[PDB]
Design a protein around this ligand. Structure first.
Ligand SMILES: [Mg+2]
Ligand SMILES: [Zn+2]
Ligand SMILES: [Zn+2]
Lengths: 49, 99, 50, 1151, 148, 89
C-alpha cells in the first residue's frame, strides 16, 4: 500500500446498523500510523497505530 | 522413496531420515480414521506402536520378522510415556490403575 | 459531540492521555509527553512519508 | 491370590493433585545446582540439571567415574560417586525435584479462568494476586473479633487491627497466606452451612450460585485432592534425556529451553535460601519471592504473564505446558490397465527395500545365507537369487496404498504386490475413482502389514476386491471411468446401415468371428440367437434361448456377461449409468466374485474396443451453429431497442439493465439449443432408401453422451458462446462473451474471463479446507459410536414415504427404504396378509415385492430411535457396507458416517456447504418463524412497547402462557382462529430447537435429514439417510431434567444415563421415583465437547484447561473410547479389537 | 453515567460478533494487557463467539467475566511492584547514615561485650589455643588476628 | 491367491471374527505347532487359513476344542511328573 492518506468505508458489517462508517488512515513510509475513524454516534476518533 | 528400518529421533523415538535415507511416511489422523472405519485394529496398533513409536516394540518385532514369526508385543508408545512424564512434571499426579 | 466525549481540557492533559495510551502502566512526565508526541509524527528521525 | 505390584497390562488411568511427599516419591534426588556439565570433560556435574548420581549413567552399564565398567556389576552403587550402573535409558525415566524455600502458586491453578484456588476459596482473583505479591494482607481464620475470614486488609489497617487484638485474630500475606487459607479450610463445615442456607432463603440468584458451589465442594471432597496441594512446596524436575544437552558438529551444542527455565528457578530459589540465612530486610526477600514465583510460573506455563525470552534469542522459551512410520514408501503413479482389480504394480527396488527384514529372514531360512549379516551383504550386493526370494515373500503378502487427500475409508486400500521394473507405482484404473487420483503426477504411498493380523486385516477388510461399494450409498464405486465406457459405448450402439445389416447368426461366437474378419461392422442391426439364463427358480438357474434383435457389438459383449443376467442389460446403448447398473444388478444377483471378475473383463474389453474405435478429437469435431450469428444479431437488436427506450426515458436504468441482461441470457440458451441439436442428430444417412437420421457418431458428442468425459455445458462453451461472465463485485456484465473457444477470444473477453477462472480456483481451494474442517467436526462428534449390541428390539422407528416435492417424486420410496429394516410388519391394501414380517432387512427382492403392491409407506427402524445405550444395535442401523449383508457387530459406524457425509462435500457450493454446516450446528436462523407454544384459540394482547404480547387460550387447560412477540414483524396467525401447537404464527425459517421441543424428536430428526439432503441432492450427491441420522443421534444426546427424585433439577445429562437410571428406577428402588426430562438438541461442535475420557478431550479441546479441570476433580479415565486408546497406543475398542476390549471389559468389574 | 465494561459486553452480545479489534478499544482503560485477551476471547467465544460454534449456556461466562473486569493498578511484572515498593523508602541524610551506623556499633559492641562476660567463652578459647599449639589445629582457624 | 473372502465371511458371519480366527489358525501354522488341513498351493499361512475357513473345517469352536484337548494331551504326559511334586506337603 502506497504511503499517503487513504479513505475507506467499512460499510455494511460494522455494528450491523447499515449506517455504514468512514475512516481515514495516514500511512507513512517509515513511522507510526495515524488513524481517524467514526462510530455509530457520529463521534470522530483517533488512534495511533 | 522407501524405508524398512532407518534412524530415529532422539527427543521422541520416531523414524527420522538422517542419511538421506528417508524417514517413513507420516500416518495422519485421517488415515487413522480410515483404519477405524475398517474393522482393522491390529493394523492400526502396529502402525502407531510397533512400527513407529515403541522403542522396544520395533526391535522385538524385527527379531520376530526375521525369525519367521509374525506377531507383535506392543507395549506402550514412547510418546504417551513422554507425555506421562511431562504431565507428571507439573503438580499433576497421573497414575495407571488396577491390574 | 466529540469534544463532549473528550475527557481532557488543555494541551498538557491531552499529552498525558496520549502518552498514557501509547505507554500505559507507567507514570507520565511533561518532558516525556512532549518528547513522545513530538517524536511521533513531527520528528525528522522517527517519521517520513518520503 | 495377591493382586499384583510389578508391571502388568494396566487398565484406565487416574489424574489428580500431587502431594509434596508424592512428588518426592518420583524424585531420586534433589537438584541443588544450576550447573549442567563440566565444560571440559563433558560429564555431568554432580547434583545438577544433568547428573549421573540423581538421574543416570552417561553410557550403558558404565559408572561415571569409571570404577565399575563391567556388565557384571549392575545393582552396585559406586563408592566414589553414587551411580547405579544400568542402561542409559533410565536417564530418560528417573525424575528429580527441588525444595522451594518459600511456597509458590501453581500458575495453571492460579490463572486458568476457572481460577481454582479462587472459586474454591470463593475469593476473587485480584484479591488473591494482591496478596501473592505482598500488595496487601488477608485475614485467615479471624476468629471472633472484628473481621471476616476471607477479608483483606492493608498495611495501616493491619497494624491498627493488630494493635487492637494481639491474638484471636490472624493475617498473613504472599503465597504462605494462600496456603494457610487453603489448609485451614474445612470443606465439611462449609457444606453443612451451604445446605441450610440453600434451604432457607428463596431466590433464584441465591440458591443457584449456592447449589453450584456446594456441588463443586463435595466434588472436590470426593476427589481426594486437598487444597494445600495447589500451592507448590516441592517442584519436580523433568528427566535430562527429555531436555537433551546433546552435542553437534563443529563442537557446538544444542539444548531444550527447559534447561534455561529450570536453571532460572534453581538460581532464584538458592538466592532466596541465602537471603533467608543472611537475614535480609523484607523489601529484598519479598522481591526474591516474587521473582521465584515468576520463574516457576514461566517454567510451568510461559503462555501467561510476560513470556520470558531465552538466552541470546528473542523467541520466547517453550515451557512444559507448551506420526512417522517404518516399513513404508511413496512415489509417482501410473496406469497398468493389464492389472487385475486385486493387485498393483510395485517397483522392484521399492519392494526390496520395504521387505528387507523378511528377505533376510527367508534367505537364512532356506539356507542361502550363513547368517543375517551375510543376508544383508547379499541383498546389498543384489545377487541374482534374492529376487526370486522376494517373489516368495511378496506372493500372499498384501500391501497398503494411500493417497494424499484421505476422506472416506476407501482412501486407503490393500492390494497384492506385482513386481515391476521401474520406479513408478502401477494403480488399477477402476480404483482411480475411489482415490480421486488423476495421473497428472499425483503421488501415492505404500505401507507394509507386518504382523499376521495386519495381513489378514488387509486382505479381509482393506482389500480392493472386498470393497466394491461406496459406504455412502449402495451404488458401485468400481464403475468404469472414461476410456472404458467410451469403449463399451462405441461397441454397444447402432448406425442405420453397415456391413452385415439384417443377417442372422447362431450366436455371439460367430458374431465376433464375423466382426474380426472385417466382414461385419461392429455396430449393425442384426438378429442373433442367444441363450440367456435366469436364476428365478428357487436357488436354481433356468436356461432359455431366443432370437434377439440386437447389434453385432452387443452380441460380442454378451460373451462377458455371466450367467443369470438378462440379455436386456446389454441390448441398450450402454452409457455410464447403464454400465453401472449392470454391475450393480450383477452384484445383487450373482454375488461378489462374479461381480469382480465381470468388472475386470468389462474394463479390459472397454479399453480394447475403445482402442480399436479410433476415437479422436479434431478441430472440425466441434460444430458451431450456422444460425448462431443470426441469434447474436437479433438479441443485439433487442439491446439497442431497450437502449433507445432508455434514451426516450420509457424505461428506468435498473429496468433497462434487467431487460438487456434477460435478452442476452435468453440468447445464450438459444445458441446452446441450436448447437445441441446440430451436434446431436445431424448425421443424415441412407439405408436402401433415400435418407434417415440418427444420433451422431461425431467424436466429442460420443464422449459427452456416453459419460466418458465432457458435458453439455462444456460442449456449449466450446461451440456456442460462453456465458455472461461477471466482475468480482458480483455484478454481471450486460455484454456477454459472444465468442467461443473454437473461435478466437479477443483481449477484453479473455481479460474479463481471467477473474471467473481465478475466483473459481480460489473458491475451490477454499472449499477444500471447508470440507476437511466439516469432516473433522463430524468425526469428533461421532467417533466412539460403534455397533455394540445386536438387536435392541424396539418397535420404534420413523415413517418412510417418498419425498414428493412439488411435482412428481424428487426421490423414490424404494431408495429411502432400501437396505433398511422394517419396524413392524406392513400390509397389502387388504389385510391379514403379512408380506414383510416384523423386522426383516429389506433387500432388492423385498423392495421389489413392496413395489409390486401399491404400498405408499414403510415404518423403518433408525439409529436415532434405537433403545441401545452407549451405541447402536446392528438390527436398527441397516445393511449398507462394502458388502450387501447387514452391518457387522463392532464395525465403527460413526467414523464412516462422518466420512461419507464429508467426502462429497468438496462438490458443494440460503444454500451450499455452509448451509450444511449451519444445519448440523443447530444454529437459529437470522429472521426465524415462531411456532405456537400451545394449541387453542389465540388473541393479540396489550399494546406497543418493543413487543405486542400474544395471549394463548387453551380450551381445557389454563392459560399461563403469554408470548411477547415484537410487532414490527408482520404476523401470520389468525387473531380470530385456533392454532395447534407448532403451527405458523409467522413465516420464515424455523429453529430446530423449536421443532424438537414443540413438534417432536422424529419431527426434528426429519427436519435436519431432509434439509441437508435437500442441499446435497440439489448438487446431485448420493448420501443415505443413515449417516445423517447417526449425526442427529449424536446431536440430541443430551437432555435437561425437569422433575426430581434421583438427580438434580436443571442438570444437562446423557439421555443414555438418564433413561438407564429411570428404567432402573421404574422398578426396584422407590416404587417409581423416576424423574422426567426434556430431550435437547446440541450443535455438533457443542456435542463433541462432551466426552467422558479426559485423554480424548485433551486432544482436540484446549489442553491446559482440560487437564486442570480434570485434575482437580481427580477424574479417572477408563479409556473405552477410540481416540483415547489411539493416543495411549493400544487396540481400538472397535473392529478387530472389539472382541479384546469386550472380553477385558467383562473380566473387569467382575470376579 | 459510567460503568465501563458492561458496554463492550452488552454490544458484543447484541451484534453476535465482534472483531478482535472491536474488543481491544472497547475494553475499559483498566485492562490493557496483551496476554489478558488470550483467555477472554475463549470466554466470550464459548458464549456467542467471535474470534475474528459455541455453548448456549452463557450464564457463568458473564459473572466470571465481570470478575475478570473487576480484576482489571498492579500490572504484575515484579520489576514494577518492586520499583514501586522500594520507591516508598526515603532517601538517607548525610547525618542519618552516621546515626544508623552508630546504632549498628552500639548493637554489635553489645553482643561482643555479652560474649566477653561469659566464662565458658573464655575457657573455650583457651582450650582451643591449647589445641593450636598441640598441632591439632591452625592459628588461622582460631583467630583472624587480634587488634593488630 | 484368495481374491474374495466372501465365502469365508459366509461361514463365520462376523467378518472381523473371520480375521481373528483365521489369524489364530495362520499362527498355528506359521510358527509350526501344526500342519495344513488343505493342500498348500504355496499359498502363505494367511490364505491357507482362509481356505480352511471356506471349507468349514476350521472355526472358533473347532480350534477351541482342539486346544482344550491338547491341554489334556500335555496334562496326561506330566501326570506322573507333577504328582511327583508331593514335596509341597
Ligand atoms: Mg489431480
Ligand atoms: Zn564411580
Ligand atoms: Zn436399535
Amino acid at each position: 500500500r502506497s504511503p499517503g492518506v487513504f479513505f475507506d468505508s467499512d460499510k455494511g458489517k460494522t455494528h450491523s446498523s447499515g449506517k455504514v462508517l468512514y475512516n481515514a488512515r495516514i500511512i507513512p513510509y517509515r513511522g507510526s500510523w495515524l488513524d481517524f475513524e467514526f462510530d455509530p454516534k457520529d463521534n470522530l476518533f483517533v488512534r495511533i497505530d | 522413496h522407501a524405508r524398512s528400518t532407518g534412524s530415529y529421533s532422539l527427543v521422541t523415538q520416531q523414524p527420522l531420515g538422517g542419511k538421506a535415507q528417508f524417514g517413513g511416511q507420516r500416518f495422519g489422523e485421517m488415515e487413522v480414521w480410515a483404519l477405524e472405519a475398517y474393522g482393522a485394529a491390529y493394523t492400526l496398533q502396529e502402525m502407531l506402536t510397533v512400527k513407529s513409536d515403541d522403542v522396544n516394540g520395533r526391535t522385538k518385532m524385527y527379531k520376530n520378522i526375521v525369525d519367521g514369526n509374525h506377531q507383535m508385543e506392543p507395549g506402550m508408545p514412547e510418546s504417551f510415556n513422554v507425555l506421562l512424564k511431562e504431565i507428571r512434571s507439573l503438580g499433576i499426579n497421573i497414575e495407571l490403575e488396577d491390574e | 459531540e466529540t469534544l463532549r466525549v473528550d475527557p481532557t481540557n488543555d494541551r498538557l492533559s491531552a499529552l498525558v492521555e496520549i502518552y498514557r495510551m501509547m505507554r500505559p502502566g507507567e507514570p507520565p512526565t511533561r518532558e516525556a509527553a512532549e518528547s513522545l508526541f513530538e517524536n511521533l509524527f513531527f520528528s525528522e528521525d522517527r517519521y517520513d512519508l518520503s | 491370590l495377591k493382586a499384583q505390584t510389578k508391571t502388568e497390562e494396566f487398565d484406565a488411568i487416574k489424574i489428580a493433585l500431587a502431594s509434596p511427599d508424592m512428588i518426592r516419591s518420583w524424585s531420586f534426588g534433589e537438584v541443588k545446582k544450576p550447573e549442567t556439565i563440566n565444560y571440559r570433560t563433558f560429564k555431568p556435574e554432580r547434583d545438577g540439571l544433568f547428573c549421573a548420581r540423581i538421574f543416570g549413567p552417561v553410557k550403558d552399564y558404565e559408572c561415571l567415574c569409571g570404577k565399575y565398567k563391567r556388565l557384571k556389576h549392575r545393582g552396585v552403587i559406586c563408592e566414589k560417586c553414587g551411580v547405579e550402573v544400568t542402561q542409559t535409558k533410565v536417564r530418560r525415566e528417573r525424575m528429580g525435584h527441588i525444595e522451594l524455600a518459600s511456597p509458590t502458586a501453581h500458575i495453571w491453578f492460579l490463572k486458568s479462568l476457572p481460577s481454582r484456588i479462587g472459586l474454591l476459596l470463593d475469593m476473587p482473583l485480584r484479591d488473591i494476586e494482591r496478596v501473592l505479591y505482598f500488595e496487601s494482607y488477608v485475614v485467615i481464620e479471624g476468629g471472633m473479633t472484628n473481621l471476616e475470614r476471607q477479608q483483606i486488609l492493608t498495611e495501616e489497617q493491619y497494624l491498627d487491627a493488630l494493635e487492637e487484638f494481639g491474638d484471636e485474630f490472624d493475617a498473613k500475606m504472599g503465597a504462605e497466606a494462600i496456603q494457610a487459607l487453603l489448609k485451614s479450610m474445612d470443606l465439611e463445615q462449609e457444606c453443612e452451612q451451604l445446605r441450610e442456607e440453600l434451604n432457607e432463603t428463596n431466590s433464584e440468584t441465591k440458591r443457584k450460585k449456592l447449589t453450584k458451589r456446594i456441588k463443586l465442594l463435595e466434588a472436590f471432597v470426593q476427589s481426594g485432592n486437598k487444597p494445600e496441594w495447589m500451592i507448590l512446596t516441592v517442584l519436580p524436575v523433568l528427566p535430562p534425556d527429555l531436555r537433551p544437552l546433546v552435542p553437534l558438529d563443529g563442537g557446538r551444542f544444542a539444548t531444550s529451553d527447559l534447561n534455561d527455565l529450570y536453571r532460572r528457578v534453581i538460581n532464584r530459589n538458592n538466592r532466596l535460601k541465602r537471603l533467608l540465612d543472611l537475614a535480609a530486610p523484607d523489601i529484598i526477600v519479598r522481591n526474591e519471592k516474587r521473582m521465584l514465583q515468576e520463574a516457576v510460573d514461566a517454567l510451568l506455563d510461559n503462555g501467561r504473564r510476560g513470556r520470558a525470552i531465552t538466552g541470546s534469542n528473542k523467541r520466547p522459551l517453550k515451557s512444559l505446558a507448551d506420526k512417522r512410520v517404518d516399513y513404508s514408501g511413496r512415489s509417482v503413479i501410473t496406469v497398468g490397465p493389464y492389472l487385475r482389480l486385486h493387485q498393483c504394480g510395485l517397483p522392484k527396488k521399492m519392494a526390496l527395500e520395504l521387505f528387507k527384514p523378511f528377505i533376510y529372514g527367508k534367505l537364512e531360512l532356506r539356507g542361502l545365507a550363513t547368517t543375517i549379516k551375510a543376508a544383508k551383504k547379499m541383498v546389498e550386493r543384489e545377487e541374482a537369487v534374492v529376487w526370486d526370494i522376494l517373489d516368495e515373500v511378496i506372493r500372499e503378502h498384501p500391501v497398503l496404498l494411500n493417497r494424499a487427500p484421505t476422506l472416506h475409508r476407501l482412501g486407503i486400500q490393500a492390494f497384492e504386490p506385482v513386481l515391476i521394473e521401474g520406479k513408478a507405482i502401477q494403480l488399477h484404473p477402476l480404483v482411480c475413482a475411489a482415490y480421486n487420483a488423476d495421473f497428472d503426477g499425483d503421488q501415492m504411498a505404500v505401507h507394509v502389514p507386518l504382523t499376521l493380523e495386519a495381513q489378514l486385516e488387509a486382505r479381509a477388510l482393506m482389500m480392493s476386491t472386498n470393497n466394491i461399494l461406496s459406504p455412502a450409498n449402495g451404488e458401485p464405486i468400481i464403475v468404469p471411468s472414461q476410456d472404458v465406457v467410451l469403449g463399451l459405448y462405441y461397441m454397444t450402439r447402432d448406425c442405420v446401415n453397415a456391413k452385415g445389416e439384417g443377417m442372422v447368426l447362431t450366436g455371439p461366437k460367430e458374431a465376433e468371428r464375423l466382426y474380426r474378419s472385417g466382414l461385419a461392422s461392429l455396430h449393425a442391426r442384426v438378429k442373433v440367437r442367444i441363450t440367456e439364463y435366469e436364476k428365478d427358480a428357487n436357488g436354481e438357474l433356468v436356461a432359455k434361448t431366443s432370437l434377439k434383435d440386437t447389434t453385432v457389438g452387443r452380441a460380442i459383449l454378451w460373451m462377458i456377461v455371466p450367467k443369470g443376467l438378462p440379455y436386456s442389460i446389454v441390448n441398450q446403448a450402454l452409457g455410464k449409468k447403464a454400465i453401472s447398473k449392470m454391475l450393480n444388478t450383477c452384484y445383487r444377483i450373482l454375488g461378489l466374485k462374479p461381480t469382480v471378475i465381470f468388472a475386470d473383463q468389462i474394463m479390459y474389453t472397454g479399453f480394447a474396443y475403445a482402442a480399436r474405435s479410433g476415437a479422436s478429437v479434431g478441430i472440425d469435431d466441434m460444430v458451431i451453429p450456422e444460425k448462431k450469428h443470426e441469434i447474436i444479431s437479433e438479441a443485439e437488436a433487442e439491446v439497442a431497442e431497450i437502449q433507445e427506450q432508455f434514451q426516450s426515458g420509457l424505461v428506468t436504468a435498473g429496468e433497462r439493465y434487467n431487460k438487456v441482461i434477460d435478452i442476452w441470457a435468453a440468447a445464450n440458451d438459444r445458441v446452446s439449443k441450436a448447437m445441441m441439436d446440430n451436434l446431436q442428430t445431424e448425421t443424415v444417412i441412407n439405408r436402401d432408401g433415400q435418407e434417415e437420421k440418427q444420433v451422431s457418431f461425431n467424436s466429442i458428442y460420443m464422449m459427452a453422451d456416453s459419460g466418458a468425459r465432457g458435458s453439455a455445458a462444456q460442449i456449449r462453451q466450446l461451440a456456442g458462446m460462453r456465458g455472461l461472465m461477471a466482475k468480482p463485485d458480483g455484478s454481471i456484465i450486460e455484454t456477454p462473451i459472444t465468442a467461443n473457444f473454437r473461435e478466437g477470444l479477443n483481449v477484453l473477453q479473455y481479460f474479463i474471463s481471467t477473474h471467473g477462472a481465478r475466483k473459481g480456483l480460489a473458491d475451490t481451494a477454499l472449499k477444500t479446507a471447508n470440507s476437511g474442517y466439516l469432516t473433522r467436526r463430524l468425526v469428533d462428534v461421532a467417533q466412539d459410536l460403534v455397533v455394540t449390541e445386536d438387536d435392541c428390539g424396539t418397535h420404534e422407528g420413523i415413517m418412510m414415504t417418498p419425498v414428493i416435492e412439488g411435482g412428481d417424486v424428487k426421490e423414490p420410496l424404494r431408495d429411502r427404504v432400501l437396505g433398511r429394516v422394517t419396524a413392524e410388519d406392513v400390509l397389502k391394501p387388504g389385510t391379514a396378509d403379512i408380506l414383510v414380517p416384523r423386522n426383516t432387512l429389506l433387500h432388492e427382492q423385498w423392495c421389489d415385492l413392496l413395489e409390486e403392491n401399491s404400498v405408499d409407506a414403510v415404518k423403518v427402524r433408525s439409529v436415532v430411535s434405537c433403545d441401545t445405550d452407549f451405541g447402536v444395535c446392528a438390527h436398527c442401523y441397516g445393511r449398507d457396507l462394502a458388502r450387501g449383508h447387514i452391518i457387522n457387530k463392532g464395525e465403527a459406524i460413526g467414523v464412516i458416517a462422518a466420512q461419507s457425509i464429508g467426502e462429497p462435500g468438496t462438490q458443494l457450493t440460503t444454500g451450499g456447504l455452509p448451509r450444511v454446516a449451519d444445519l448440523f450446528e443447530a444454529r437459529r436462523p437470522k429472521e426465524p418463524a415462531i411456532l405456537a407454544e400451545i394449541s387453542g384459540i389465540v388473541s393479540f394482547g396489550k399494546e406497543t412497547k418493543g413487543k405486542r404480547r400474544l395471549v394463548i387460550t387453551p380450551v381445557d387447560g389454563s392459560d399461563p402462557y403469554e408470548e411477547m412477540i415484537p410487532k414490527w414483524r408482520q404476523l401470520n396467525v389468525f387473531e380470530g382462529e385456533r392454532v395447534e401447537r407448532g403451527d405458523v404464527i409467522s413465516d420464515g425459517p424455523e429453529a430446530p430447537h423449536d421443532i424438537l421441543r414443540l413438534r417432536g424428536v422424529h419431527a426434528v430428526t426429519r427436519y435436519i435429514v431432509n434439509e441437508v439432503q435437500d442441499v446435497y441432492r440439489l448438487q446431485g450427491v448420493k448420501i443415505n439417510d443413515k449417516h445423517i441420522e447417526v449425526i442427529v443421534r449424536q446431536m440430541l444426546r443430551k437432555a435437561t431434567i425437569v422433575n426430581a427424585g434421583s438427580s438434580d433439577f436443571l442438570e444437562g445429562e446423557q439421555v443414555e444415563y438418564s433413561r438407564v437410571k429411570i428404567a432402573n428406577r421404574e422398578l426396584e428402588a422407590n416404587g417409581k421415583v423416576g424423574a422426567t426430562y426434556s430431550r435437547d438438541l446440541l450443535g455438533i461442535t457443542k456435542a463433541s465437547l462432551a466426552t467422558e475420557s479426559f485423554i480424548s478431550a485433551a486432544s482436540f479441546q484446549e489442553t491446559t484447561r482440560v487437564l486442570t479441570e480434570a485434575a482437580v476433580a481427580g477424574k479417572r479415565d477408563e479409556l473405552r473410547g477410540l481416540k483415547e486408546n489411539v493416543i495411549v497406543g493400544r487396540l481400538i475398542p472397535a473392529g478387530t479389537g472389539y472382541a479384546y476390549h469386550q472380553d477385558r471389559m467383562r473380566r473387569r468389574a467382575a470376579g | 453515567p459510567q460503568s465501563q465494561l458492561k458496554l463492550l459486553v452488552t454490544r458484543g452480545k447484541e451484534q453476535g460478533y465482534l472483531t478482535y479489534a472491536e474488543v481491544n478499544d472497547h475494553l475499559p482503560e483498566d485492562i490493557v494487557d496483551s496476554d489478558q485477551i488470550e483467555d477472554i476471547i475463549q470466554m466470550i467465544n464459548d458464549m456467542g463467539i467471535q474470534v475474528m460454534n459455541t455453548a448456549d449456556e452463557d450464564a457463568a461466562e458473564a459473572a466470571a467475566q465481570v470478575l475478570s473486569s473487576v480484576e482489571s493498578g498492579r500490572t504484575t511484572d515484579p520489576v514494577r511492584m518492586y520499583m514501586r515498593e522500594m520507591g516508598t523508602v526515603e532517601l538517607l541524610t548525610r547525618e542519618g547514615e552516621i546515626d544508623i551506623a552508630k546504632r549498628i556499633e552500639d548493637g554489635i559492641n553489645q553482643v561482643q561485650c555479652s560474649v566477653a562476660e561469659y566464662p565458658e567463652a573464655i575457657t573455650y578459647l583457651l582450650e582451643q589455643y591449647d589445641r593450636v599449639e598441640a598441632e591439632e589445629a591452625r592459628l588461622s582457624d582460631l583467630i583472624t588476628g587480634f587488634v593488630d | 491367491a484368495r481374491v474374495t473372502v466372501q465365502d469365508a465371511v459366509e461361514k463365520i458371519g462376523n467378518r472381523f471374527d473371520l480375521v481373528l480366527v483365521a489369524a489364530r489358525r495362520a499362527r498355528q501354522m506359521q510358527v509350526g505347532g501344526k500342519d495344513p488341513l488343505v493342500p498348500e498351493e504355496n499359498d502363505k499361512t494367511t490364505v491357507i487359513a482362509l481356505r480352511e475357513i471356506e471349507e468349514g473345517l476350521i472355526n472358533n469352536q473347532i480350534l477351541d476344542v482342539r486346544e482344550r484337548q491338547e491341554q489334556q494331551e500335555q496334562e496326561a504326559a506330566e501326570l506322573q511328573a507333577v504328582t511327583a511334586i508331593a514335596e509341597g506337603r
